Design a protein around this ligand. Structure first.
Ligand SMILES: [Co+2]
Length: 38
């Protein structure tokens, strides 16, 4: 838990994220995600 697979991308609601080298952070888009956006 509290982790991602390094260098993977993943989705969180309407946002997309790229997992850091450490697996402990991710670079994510910051879009507001209203209903229907995902
Ligand atoms: Co963990």
């Amino acid at each position: 838990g509290s982790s991602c697979t390094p260098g993977t991308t993943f989705r969180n609601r309407c946002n997309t994220c790229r997992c850091g080298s450490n697996g402990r952070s991710a670079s994510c888009t910051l879009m507001a995600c209203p209903p229907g956006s995902y």
